[PDB]
From a paper:
The transporter P-glycoprotein (P-gp; ABCB1; EC 3.6.3.44) is expressed in the intestines, liver, kidney and blood–brain barrier, and affects the bioavailability, pharmacokinetics and efficacy of drugs. P-gp belongs to a superfamily of ATP-binding cassette (ABC) transporters found throughout all kingdoms of life. Each half is formed by six transmembrane helices (TMs) and one cytosolic nucleotide-binding domain (NBD) along with interconnecting loops and short helices.
The R groups of this series were systematically varied to generate alanine-, valine-, leucine- and phenylalanine-derived compounds (QZ-Ala, QZ-Val, QZ-Leu and QZ-Phe, respectively) of increasing R-group size and hydrophobicity. We measured the effect of each ligand on the basal level of ATP hydrolysis of purified P-gp. Consistent with these substrate-like interactions, P-gp mediated mild resistance to QZ-Ala in cells. Here, four new P-gp co-crystal structures with a series of rationally designed ligands are presented. It is observed that the binding of certain ligands, including an ATP-hydrolysis stimulator, produces a large conformational change in the fourth transmembrane helix, which is positioned to potentially transmit a signal to the nucleotide-binding domains. Thus, we must conclude that the binding of subset A ligands induces these changes in TM4. For co-crystal structures pertaining to subset A ligands, the movement of TM4 brings residues 221–228 closer to the bound ligands in the lower binding sites, fostering an intermolecular interaction with Trp228, a residue that has been implicated in steroid binding to P-gp. Here, we only demonstrate two distinct changes in TM4 (kinked or straight helical) caused by two different subsets of ligands.
Residue numbers in the entry:
A (entry chain C), C (entry chain B): 1 to 6
B (entry chain A): 30 to 626, 692 to 1278
The structure:
């Protein structure tokens, strides 16, 4: 939830 | 439990397969390493903006000067990074395709071989191997296990290695960029890992283990709907509904408890995730302020490591996939590796020429593979001369058939030898042996093809001329030629079902094309009509005369012409010789000779609660509004830190964020638990309302509906559980999540859109495309899945045909035929599986490449055009997050789609079942309720056909009259005609024509309940519900509670009191098999008690003594006899000796009363009743 | 992976 995947 | 070696499983992969697997797993590992490298550059981007972010704010003096160096740095850097990203995209594209394609190819190529080899091995088994095994299990084992194997060696491996690669690569970059944050996160790793796994377990609850909590109600429901006629008769529907309602009442409470706990759990898990996630980052900032780490490095290691962490979690499932595949491959390969003794696929042994057909069985001991339990053949000696025909006879054991069994070498004998001509049968090739022996069996089988083909299963090479001569020589030519389509007519289990003799003749023709030297006929004449028997017998006789023959049957009409007749006793050959000799012998043969001579309307039902919804939606919208706040912070955390300028103010600002970062967390515990609790409690209540309204309405329906084969107790309870279980899921969590997700994307998109100008408008062009591109892929996956299931369904169908009838095909050989047909069947799915790999790869790589290319357009537009303007990085980082997670939230919309569909299909039935109304409803308060006690019964010109079977009428113009206080005995030839009276008086049905009265009023206009309230019904096998026997006796009268002394009196009248006072619990004892067991006598006496506790004016005894014996009949008959004589009565009981005292006896014939009158009058007359009595009476004397 | 970020 930023940019990777979270 | 049992498993397989890793190298043995792949034994069918060679040459190109291993290569595919290598290049595939290689490309997979590349694909795996690809992602964490993406997060690596992402830190370098941060450093670029960070270097300028600090210097830009550090000036506060010159402006234009910052328009030169900064923009150049961003130019070169951003261009480099974008170039790299674009570089990654093509890579992931190619390697993805390579990976999935190659692995799928390998899988298909192998599985094909697996199937072929396996089926071959199946066909290669000797009969003894089949005798000990279930064929259905074996075929299903084929079709399913090969599929498991397919799932195992499939692309799952590529995914596994790719995951392992992301894991290693992620942790490599993580460690190398810095050691501390990794270890810290490795302290975080167990914490979070423990939380997420539990969360997933909580979500999966919808599958049915649910019985443990619910089944208490299901038990009531089942015994009720099983007893439906009894509860109908005694009209205790309100009570049963009450009980069910109470059980539901408990169920819902347990439900809301589970909801509370589960919601708390999920919330807590989310909190732990939040807290750890934030904590690690706070420590990160704490490390950046020390200038030990760069702000971007923190991101890089954080995300790389977390990626690496979850890779395991998403890696694990593929292990189980490969794991299950080995275990499945075990039992499969076991059959393929198994080498039999008999073979018959072998080319070996002698193939003798000019066989005269001199057969001898020498000292043969044998047993089938029931083994030591029974030995059927003890020793033996038999010869049959060339050209002769021997007939085997026996009383039982079918040791006769054993010889025909052994002569085909289906089994090799325990001891002894069977010798065709001069040579041991085992020296000669099996196939040739089978081909030199023709066989005709009691039950002929015909595979499904044209007649020609079935005749062609005699020999693969043949012409219609030979078929013609073959069937004509079997005299089957006429019968088939009269048939349409000529030789091309269809035969089998489905379609064109023919006469047994004709099928037998076709079989004889098929056997005749075989042109065998040896002929084995086993009871082919037996189990067939006498007329066609001679027709087929002519053929059988004509099938001989060129051959030596061993024949076995139960009909001695065909034996006389035999050259030698052979009797058996206990497996021991005894009598042999010509007929006259055996008759002169006066032995076993002579003995046998002498012996044989849009529905929102359901949403309107949930509208019962106006609240509990608004709460959850408002809360879930606030949660939806709370979700992107997480992204806004993370943006400004890295944003302010990037935009920091003077450092002094940062530390405090980053620390106040990480606080707030958690603050949305704790508040997320409140909102998540709420929207889960409100929707949960709302789910368990309507489940009570629905099941209560469903069950109720199910007791409304009459017997006509319950007699329906479409509706059975199990099907009703299933329909009862499922739909109510299903509608809850649609009105449940899913909806809340959807609202949460649209609120999420909505707030996210508002924020993103208002912050980034056209930055967001851009993404909104990209994101819905990759999402829709994600859904369409799943659609193609299901399409190819369904289409593939249809093709192998055809190849599995020819397998079932082969292995179910197998014992026949082995006799005819031509297993190679089924090998070939099976192969040709498989060939189509094979070429299909080749295209599968081509498609699975493209759709995968396209979806990956699009996500990577999308990520390029992100920072490229975020940089350049946007960043050359005054628009800033912190917003870019915000928008990407917000939007993309809005999307990944939208994904759950697609994921949750099928639930509403299933729930709609399940919600379709549940309204219909309520809205259905009966012909006779027990609930209506209408009807007369007469004031006059005394009953009579008038049956007049009644005609009745059961709604289930409107073919053979049970009643036609039946007419009866019985006054009060006198017994009406009812005798009949047979059928429900005797019972239908009792059924119609209870008014389970209204007759087709005619009418029935009681006090002279027509019951049809009478109140149903009041009608049934005056009746004393007692059935054959009385069903008692689980509860106090006093409650089973008190079941006789409802709407009022029965007194103790009353049920005592009723128990005294029924002569059951001997038991009730004898028991330890007495009247409070439990019966109905849950707590106690009783015999039929006690149960019946109880039925009598509940019958006469009602104080009916009409007793109805339906074959009460049906199941019973000895003194029980006496005492129960005593009770029943005592029960009547004070009331109107109709007794259909099958003991006519007990009817000898009756006021009126009535003999029923074909639905019309035939004879009627008092006993001595019907006895004075000589007719049906006299015969009825005469046959059963004195039979006791015959018994003496 | 549930919904917050893992």
């Amino acid at each position: 939830x930023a940019x990777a995947x979270a | 439990k049992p498993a397989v070696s890793v190298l043995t499983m792949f034994r069918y992969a060679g040459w190109l397969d291993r290569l595919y697997m290598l290049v595939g797993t290689l490309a997979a590992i590349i694909h795996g390493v690809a992602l964490p490298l993406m997060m690596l550059i992402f830190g370098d981007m941060t450093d670029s903006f960070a270097s300028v972010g600090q210097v830009s704010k550090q000036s506060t003096q010159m402006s234009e000067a910052d328009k030169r160096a900064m923009f150049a740095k961003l130019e070169e850097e951003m261009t480099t990074y974008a170039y790299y990203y674009t570089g990654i995209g093509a890579g992931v594209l190619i390697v993805a395709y390579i990976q999935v394609s190659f692995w799928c190819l390998a899988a298909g190529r192998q599985i094909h071989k697996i199937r072929q080899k396996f089926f071959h091995a199946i066909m290669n088994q000797e009969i003894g191997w089949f005798d000990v095994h279930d064929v259905g299990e074996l075929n299903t084992r084929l079709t399913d296990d090969v599929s498991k194997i397919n799932e195992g060696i499939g692309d799952k491996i590529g995914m596994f290695f790719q995951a392992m690669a992301t894991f290693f690569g992620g942790f490599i970059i993580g460690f190398t960029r810095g050691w501390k944050l990794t270890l810290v996160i490795l302290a975080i790793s167990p914490v979070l890992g423990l939380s997420a796994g539990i969360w997933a377990k909580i979500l999966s609850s919808f599958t049915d283990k649910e019985l443990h909590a619910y089944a208490k109600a299901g038990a009531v429901a089942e015994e009720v709907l099983a007893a439906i006629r009894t509860v109908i008769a005694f009209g205790g529907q309100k009570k049963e509904l009450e009980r069910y309602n109470n059980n539901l009442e408990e169920a819902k409470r347990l439900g809301i408890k589970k909801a509370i706990t589960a919601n708390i759990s999920m919330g807590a898990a989310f909190l732990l995730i939040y807290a750890s996630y934030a904590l690690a980052f706070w420590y990160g900032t704490s490390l950046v302020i020390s200038k030990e780490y760069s702000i971007g490095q923190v991101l890089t290691v954080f995300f790389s490591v977390l990626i690496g962490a979850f890779s395991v979690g998403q890696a694990s499932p593929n292990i189980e996939a490969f794991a299950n595949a080995r275990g499945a491959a075990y039992e499969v390969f076991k059959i393929i590796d198994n080498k039999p003794s008999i073979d018959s696929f072998s080319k070996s042994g002698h193939k003798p020429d000019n066989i005269q057909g001199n057969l001898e069985f020498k000292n043969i001991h044998f047993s089938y593979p029931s083994r030591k339990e029974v030995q059927i053949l003890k020793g033996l000696n038999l010869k049959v001369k060339s050209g002769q025909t021997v007939a085997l006879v026996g009383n039982s054991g079918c040791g006769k058939s054993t010889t025909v069994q052994l002569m085909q070498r289906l089994y090799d004998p325990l001891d002894g030898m069977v010798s065709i001509d001069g040579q041991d049968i085992r020296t000669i090739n099996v196939r040739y042996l089978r081909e030199i022996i023709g066989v005709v069996s009691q039950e002929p089988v015909l595979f499904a093809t044209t007649i020609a083909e079935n005749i062609r299963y005699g020999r693969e090479d043949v012409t219609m001329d030979e078929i013609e001569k073959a069937v004509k020589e079997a005299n089957a030519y006429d019968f088939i030629m009269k048939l349409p389509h000529q030789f091309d007519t269809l035969v089998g289990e489905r379609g064109a079902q023919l006469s047994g003799g004709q099928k037998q003749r076709i079989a004889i023709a098929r056997a005749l094309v075989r042109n065998p030297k040896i002929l084995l006929l086993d009871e082919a004449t037996s189990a067939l009509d006498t007329e066609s028997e001679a027709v087929v017998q002519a053929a059988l006789d004509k099938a001989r005369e060129g051959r030596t023959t061993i024949v076995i049957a139960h009909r001695l009409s065909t034996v006389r012409n035999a050259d030698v007749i052979a009797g058996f006793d206990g497996g021991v050959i005894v009598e042999q010789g010509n007929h006259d000799e055996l008759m002169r012998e006066k032995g076993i043969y002579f003995k046998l000779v002498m012996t044989q001579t849009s529905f929102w309307r359901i949403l309107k039902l949930n509208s019962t609660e106006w609240p509990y919804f608004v709460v959850g939606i408002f809360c879930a919208i606030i949660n939806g509004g709370l979700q992107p706040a997480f992204s806004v912070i993370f943006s400004k955390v890295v944003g302010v830190f990037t935009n920091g300028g003077p450092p002094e103010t940062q530390r405090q600002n980053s620390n106040l964020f990480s606080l707030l970062f958690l603050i949305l967390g704790i508040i997320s515990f409140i909102t998540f638990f709420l929207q889960g609790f409100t929707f949960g409690k709302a789910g368990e209540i309507l489940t009570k309302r629905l099941r209560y309204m469903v069950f109720k309405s199910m007791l409304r329906q009459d017997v006509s509906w319950f007699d329906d084969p479409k509706n059975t107790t199990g099907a009703l309870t299933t329909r009862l559980a499922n739909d109510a279980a299903q509608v809850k899921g649609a009105t449940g969590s899913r909806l809340a999540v959807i609202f949460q997700n649209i609120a999420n994307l909505g707030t996210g998109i508002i924020i993103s859109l208002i912050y980034g100008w056209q930055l967001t408008l851009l993404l909104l062009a990209i994101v819905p495309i990759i999402a829709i591109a994600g859904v369409v892929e799943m659609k193609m996956l299901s399409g190819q899945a369904l289409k593939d299931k249809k093709e192998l369904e055809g190849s599995g169908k020819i397998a079932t045909e082969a292995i179910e009838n197998f014992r026949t095909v082995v006799s005819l050989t031509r297993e190679q035929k089924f090998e070939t047909m099976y192969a040709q069947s498989l060939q189509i799915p094979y070429r299909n599986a080749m295209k599968k790999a081509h498609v699975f790869g493209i759709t995968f790589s396209f979806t990956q490449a699009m996500m990577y290319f999308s990520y390029a357009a992100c920072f490229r537009f975020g940089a350049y055009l946007v960043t050359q303007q005054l628009m800033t990085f912190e917003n870019v980082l915000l928008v990407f997050s917000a939007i993309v997670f809005g999307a990944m939230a939208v994904g759950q919309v697609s994921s949750f789609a099928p639930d509403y569909a299933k729930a709609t299909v399940s919600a379709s039935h549940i309204i219909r079942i309520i809205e259905k109304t009966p012909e006779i409803d027990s609930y209506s308060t209408q009807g007369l309720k007469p004031n006059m006690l005394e009953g009579n019964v008038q049956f007049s010109g009644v005609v009745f056909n059961y709604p289930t079977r409107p073919s053979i009428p049970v009643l036609q113009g039946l007419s009866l009259e019985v006054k009060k206080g006198q017994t009406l005995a009812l005798v009949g030839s047979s059928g429900c005609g005797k019972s239908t009276v009792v059924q119609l008086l209870e008014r389970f049905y209204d007759p087709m024509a005619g009418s029935v009265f009681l006090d002279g009023k027509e019951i049809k206009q009478l109140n149903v309940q009041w009608l049934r309230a005056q009746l004393g019904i007692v059935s054959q096998e009385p069903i008692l519900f689980d509860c106090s026997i006093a409650e089973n006796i008190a079941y006789g009268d409802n709407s009022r509670v029965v007194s103790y002394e009353e049920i005592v009196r009723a128990a005294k009248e029924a002569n059951i009191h001997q038991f009730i006072d004898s028991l330890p619990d007495k009247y409070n004892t439990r019966v109905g098999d849950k707590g106690t067991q009783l015999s039929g006598g006690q149960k019946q006496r109880i039925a009598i008690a509940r019958a006469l506790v009602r104080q009916p004016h009409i007793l109805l005894l339906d074959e009460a003594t049906s199941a019973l014996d000895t003194e029980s009949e006496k005492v129960v008959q005593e009770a029943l006899d005592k029960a009547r004589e004070g009331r109107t009565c109709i007794v259909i009981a099958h003991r006519l000796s007990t009817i000898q005292n009756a006021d009126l006896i009535v003999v029923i014939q074909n639905g019309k009363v035939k004879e009627h009158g008092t006993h001595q009058q019907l006895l004075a007359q000589k007719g049906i009743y006299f015969s009825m009595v005469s046959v059963q009476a004195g039979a006791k004397r015959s018994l003496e």
